[PDB]
Amino acid sequence: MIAQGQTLPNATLSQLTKEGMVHHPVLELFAGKKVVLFAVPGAFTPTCSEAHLPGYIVLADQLKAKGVDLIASVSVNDAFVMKAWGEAQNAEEILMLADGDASFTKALGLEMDTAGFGGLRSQRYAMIIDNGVVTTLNVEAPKSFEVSNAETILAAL
Amino acid sequence: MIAQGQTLPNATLSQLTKEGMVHHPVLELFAGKKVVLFAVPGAFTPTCSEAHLPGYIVLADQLKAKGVDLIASVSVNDAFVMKAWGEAQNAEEILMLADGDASFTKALGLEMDTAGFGGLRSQRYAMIIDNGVVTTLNVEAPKSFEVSNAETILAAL
């Protein structure tokens, strides 16, 4: 998988705007910013709340107070589903990003096969990204109960 | 791995009673009964969407209504910890069983390595055991969001 100190893959993530589909080069979107990015295996799927959208929603103020410019949620889902999920969660403060063909996730080496559930999806992870460089990367290790969360990211700041 | 239709290996499970530590072959405990057995990776381990013991506690009367004689919970833990865990969850109904050296779990082929967390533990699974025969076996598959919860067992009944 990607290492700390490496620049993110020079790839895109998509978002639905009033302009239609926008494909953000992540290295442009995250340039000049301290960014918190977290991934889930799917929009609307269950994850310990502290480790995905609800956790980052309630910690958003504290994260921004410690210098985070942008908090973003990514998943192997399309941009319509990601928009709907943000709306359902009232994810005001969080940028919803779509990796619909799993290309960004595979470039990170953080894909996983869910077989009949949903095909290839993302592992759960969270990053602090400084000007496009991965500074902190925490990846779920479910068999050993490595129970990292938004607080883990807050403390890394 | 043990399979549906097979009879349990007569491996030992332990308990703490007024005699202190005691142990019995599992068929001494389960013969002549319809038993629901729920296994976890560890006592006091958290759940978010996975099956959990309080789910069996809430459905205990409905399980018994459908012919279950005994609801039991097993883990690779010792009997003092299993007793404490049962008390913490107000699980006086449920029989708390200890597989302290993982011999029962290994006999079933349902072990998993948790490495630095807790060494060798059990996968999360549930069984319906009719006079020693595993008539239903549901093993969790977290990557596909398949859970071995009490409702799954209730539907199998």
> How many angstroms away from the CA of A3 is the closest CA of chain B?
22
Q: Do A135 and A123 touch, CB atoms closer than 8 A?
A: no
Three-class DSSP category at A142: helix
Quote the longest CA-to-CA distance of chain B.
44
- Give contacts of A117 with chain B, Cβ < 8 Å: 143-146
Torsion of CA B100, B101, B104, B108, to 10 degrees: 130
Q: Does B45 touch chain A (CB under 8 A)?
A: yes
Q: Does A147 touch chain B (CB under 8 A)?
A: yes
Asked if B143 lies within 8 A of A114 by C-beta distance, the reply is yes
Q: Catalytic annotation on A48?
A: yes
- A88 backbone dihedrals φ, ψ, rounded to 5°: -65, -30
For the record, the structure tokens of A25 come out as 């080069």
- Give contacts of A110 with chain B, Cβ < 8 Å: none
Asked if A46 lies within 8 A of B49 by C-beta distance, the reply is yes
Q: Do B4 and B137 touch, CB atoms closer than 8 A?
A: yes
Q: Which residues pair with A133 in a beta bridge?
A: A7, A130
* B1-157 fold: Glutaredoxin (3.40.30)
B108 DSSP assignment: H
Three-class DSSP category at A70: strand
Q: Do B120 and B126 touch, CB atoms closer than 8 A?
A: no
| Torsion sign, CA atoms A51, A57, A62, A66 | positive
Structural resolution in Å: 1.5
Q: How was this structure determined?
A: X-ray
Residue B7 CB partners (closer than 8 Å, separation 6+): B132, B133, B134
Three-class DSSP category at B37: strand
Asked if B114 lies within 8 A of A145 by C-beta distance, the reply is yes
